[PDB]
Ligand binder design. Structure first.
Ligand SMILES: [Cl-]
Lengths: 349, 350
């Protein structure tokens, strides 16, 4: 299963990157694969929708009045635009907390454009600027709602992180021992499980959206998953920002799916049932997860866009909005194109 | 074969990177290896000392009076610091040329601290700020020295580029057809050849400097290689810049080797004869070349340092100057250590 994305200079191989991908149905049955579809994989921020679920199922969180844009921010790895920071502060007021209560730190923006502004300003990013700030405020919310004490909401012994750990395992349909945990850049526990289970999570998100839309009776959990899908698709700029893959991908598909970046080159997508999914051989929703073995983001976005093409998800029209991600520009300092990106991999079913 | 450098988060595999490496003696004989030591590889800026050789061997260049720091800038991927721009301009004045004669383009500095300062200032890098500006001024020089005309010094049909292609193949001991050619970021022809041959080039640099130091007869080309090594070793800040691996590596070793980065994560080192190289089983200078298959520079610097330590080159003292390249920091936004870097490969030897 030698599946690669490859860059060339004048047709000479520059770099090559090993690709893993899983394509699963709404129960997580594996439908297509690249590389090792069960690779044990840190999901990183691609697990944010499952953290958002653990927040939304925390009793009393409903009392704070978070809106859909708020929930989308809980699912986000945002670009620290002024609207993201403003929303972080506004969410903190809702729970009568302060920036001092966050246990996440500032960092250079995920948007080069934002970061340039910051440099010109000599702006020092603080906790509320964290790309994960929405998820931390959600967790603080949960901690206050159960009377747990906000100190250490971010540590594994805290009930808020016990709810995350349980929720992740449940969504993956794994025993607790089959999920491993480390600590992320924003100082939260972050899960590792087989790659296909990441796609299983996103298949469940889209499936719940399908059930909601069709008027089907739903469990509290399904209803909440459907609320999360709608939040992300309706406010995709909260999930990332202007110019960001996730935001442009989700705007292009106009509610048809959701997508989320995980750091070090993971990606997950949840596709509502359609002609395309039926053509692929399932009668429900579908889930896609991808990992680039070496962590290269640019190659990741190329592969995800190629993968959608090969699955016939969308249209040439929809997917063209992502063209600059699909075939990255390889132009030298004098305006000369010096190479390209190719995709020597083969989907197996 | 499957030789990897692996990052982890809490002991959980995060990313893994395939490593190719060749360690060769002064004639290119292969001594140790990782991965595919003959991987067809674009050498990128690791080829710039071969380009300086072609420059220095061009009829009439000697009369411009380039000095050792000038030659070091020819061999460089510099950080575009003010001193690199000043030396680029000084070199243009040696050949009576202008910035408008350069055929390379500006780019974000290879240095984050320089680049931040540019952004703070709204500075737009120009031709003269290119990391290869030294090489471009040397190819301009050679074209003017033989009356070839400054326009098009960068094109493959130009006798300056004809001389470069010839010099590269000769240093690799390869036939012309065994070298492939693309175009680089700085708009020059750039070569590709088996990875071990990049190490062969750098063993020749180190062997030439040994023979010059011992004062045996030397070809004009061996004399020129010994000069390139000396210039790189004496002005390593010109080869890269403050804080840069190549500068800190050559400084630490104090003339015992030269080292040079290739874009998309190739590396080459040339090692003078030593108690270490004699312990490695060869009676002369040594060449090391490395390619990280996926192009990660952070992983490259980590692996090269691990390689020197495994090979016994330097002392634990010398190499401790490279400690934060050997094991890159893995500390999150709150000061918590979240992971690390390991080197689960074994060097194979024959
Ligand atoms: Cl981290």
């Amino acid at each position: 299963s030698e599946d690669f994305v490859v860059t060339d200079r004048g047709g000479i191989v520059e770099n090559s990157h090993r690709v893993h991908a899983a394509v699963v149905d709404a129960k997580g049955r594996l439908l297509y694969a690249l590389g090792n579809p069960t690779r044990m994989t840190l999901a990183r921020s691609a697990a944010k929708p499952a953290q958002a679920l653990a927040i939304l199922e925390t009793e009393g969180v409903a009392g704070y009045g978070f809106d859909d844009a708020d929930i989308a921010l809980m699912c986000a790895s945002h670009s620290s635009e002024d609207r993201h920071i403003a929303r972080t502060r506004a969410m903190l007021s809702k729970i009568k907390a302060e920036e001092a209560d966050l246990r996440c730190g500032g960092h250079p923006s995920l948007s080069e454009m934002v970061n340039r502004s910051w440099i010109k300003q000599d702006f020092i990013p603080t906790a509320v600027c964290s790309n994960c700030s929405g998820a931390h405020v959600g967790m603080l919310a949960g901690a206050r709602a159960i009377g747990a004490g906000t100190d250490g909401y971010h540590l594994p012994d805290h009930p808020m992180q016990g709810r995350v750990k349980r929720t992740v395992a449940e969504l993956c349909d794994l025993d607790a021992g089959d999920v491993e945990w480390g600590t992320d850049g924003c100082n939260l526990p972050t899960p590792a499980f087989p790659l296909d289970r990441l796609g299983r999570i996103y298949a469940k998100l889209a499936s719940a959206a399908d059930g909601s839309d069709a008027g089907e009776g739903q469990s509290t959990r399904c209803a909440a998953l459907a609320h999360i899908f709608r939040a992300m698709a309706r406010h995709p700029e909260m999930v990332a920002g202007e110019g960001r893959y996730c935001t442009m991908l989700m705007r292009a598909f106009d509610g048809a799916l959701v997508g989320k970046l995980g750091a070090d080159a993971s990606y997950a997508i949840g596709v509502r049932a359609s002609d395309a999914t039926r053509q692929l051989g399932t009668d429900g929703a579908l889930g896609i997860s991808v990992k680039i073995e070496d962590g290269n983001l640019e190659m990741l976005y190329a592969v995800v866009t190629e993968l959608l093409e090969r699955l016939g998800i969308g249209s040439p029209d929809v997917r063209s909005q992502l063209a600059s991600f699909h075939h990255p520009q390889r132009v030298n300092t004098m305006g000369v194109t010096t190479g390209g990106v190719s995709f020597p991999f083969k989907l197996r079913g």
